[PDB]
């Protein structure tokens, strides 16, 4: 047990002003604190709240070595890819979850927060990559992607693409293409002191 009563900084993550781009997803470590998970589910202001490896229904009785809160922005259609054993541009080239994933995945629409008249081009995603991503791996490289046989020498053109491309977060867009904020809670359980716990 922790032996100290300090609420965990979940507000910092869910209510953060600006979210990171999925290619450079943000990760916050959580330790030496206590927090009520069931408050989140009870709020019921989220559109997707799926947990793998643990019941969501008021499961605060459990204590974990560490917790990880990963946040980013994607499209609605792409939310289905933020789960174990899924394929797609996001799952392959941006954010991968392991098949033995024990955690929770939370997602909610943010059209009012992350749209701007004429488009918001601040949120990018990786479009070209030579190989798939390993689980919980992050790639921020901006090197020109050489598709042809000829070298690119760091110049944009045909067969020489910049790897990252921008989301067309238009305000008049359909739900499938509207921005969605995602937070992935991972529960690192190990043979180490339990620094995170439930209430009481």
């Amino acid at each position, epitope marked *: 047990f922790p032996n100290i009563t300090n609420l965990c900084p979940f507000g910092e993550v869910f209510n953060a002003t600006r979210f990171a781009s999925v290619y450079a997803w943000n990760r916050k470590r959580i330790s030496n604190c206590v927090a009520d998970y069931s408050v989140l589910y009870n709020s019921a202001s989220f559109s997707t709240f799926k947990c793998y490896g643990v019941s969501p229904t008021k499961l605060n009785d459990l204590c974990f070595t560490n917790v990880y809160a990963d946040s980013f922005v994607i499209r609605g259609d792409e939310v289905r890819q933020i789960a174990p054993g899924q394929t797609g541009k996001i799952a392959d080239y941006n954010y991968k979850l392991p098949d033995d994933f024990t955690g929770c995945v939370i997602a909610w629409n943010s059209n009012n927060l992350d749209s701007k008249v004429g488009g918001n081009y601040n949120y990018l995603y990786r479009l070209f990559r030579k190989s798939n991503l390993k689980p919980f791996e992050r790639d921020i490289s901006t090197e020109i992607y050489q598709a042809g046989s000829t070298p690119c020498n760091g110049v944009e053109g045909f*067969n020489c693409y910049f790897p990252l491309q921008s989301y067309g977060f238009q305000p008049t867009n359909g739900v499938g293409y509207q921005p969605y904020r995602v937070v992935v809670l991972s529960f690192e359980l190990l043979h180490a002191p339990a620094t995170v716990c439930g209430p009481k």
Partner: antibody
Amino acid sequence: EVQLVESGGGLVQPGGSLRLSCAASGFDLGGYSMHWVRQAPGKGLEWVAGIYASGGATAYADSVKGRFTISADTSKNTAYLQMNSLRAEDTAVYYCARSYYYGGFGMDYWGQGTLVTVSS
Amino acid sequence: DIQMTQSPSSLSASVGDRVTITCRASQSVSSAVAWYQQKPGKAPKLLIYSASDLYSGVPSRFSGSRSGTDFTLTISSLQPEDFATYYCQQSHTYPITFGQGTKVEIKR
């Protein structure tokens, strides 16, 4: 309502020249690449040429390299395909389409197409 | 200079069936494949792009998948309007190349 309209199709003798035009409405050519795709009667689709409107870079297919030339105009917001030294093998329905970036994306909008016949 | 091999060349199936069409690329193309539909005397209509991304205004029955260098287009349930020709296209390495085509005919 994005729209792409072809023009300039017709009948030309072997070895002649013909200039196809593709006028765009509802969007700006900037940041986009305009492509020309031809389809022979009762046959598959074959890519011909493409151009990045902003930078002016071009790319052609091996079969028509040298003979055809692709261009664009930003103020007119239209794309052109000049076809010189035409051959009977080139007879087909020519479509103009657009894609985002130099590559990686599909063709969102196609024109209705224009028929080009090459015969003596 | 990549070659896209499309199968089947022709397919006959009944309304309400689940259909699958495959396109294998000569080389790795990441996820730059797209799927188009063409009806007689009409321009191709874009169905899927970047392998597994639905296009606005397109029935949800159409889906796209990528396994390595193999790409798949799936129809959950067929509707009378889905009887047409289907092409796959790659935009990874120029010159861009389409597939041979797959004609879908109503069984009778």
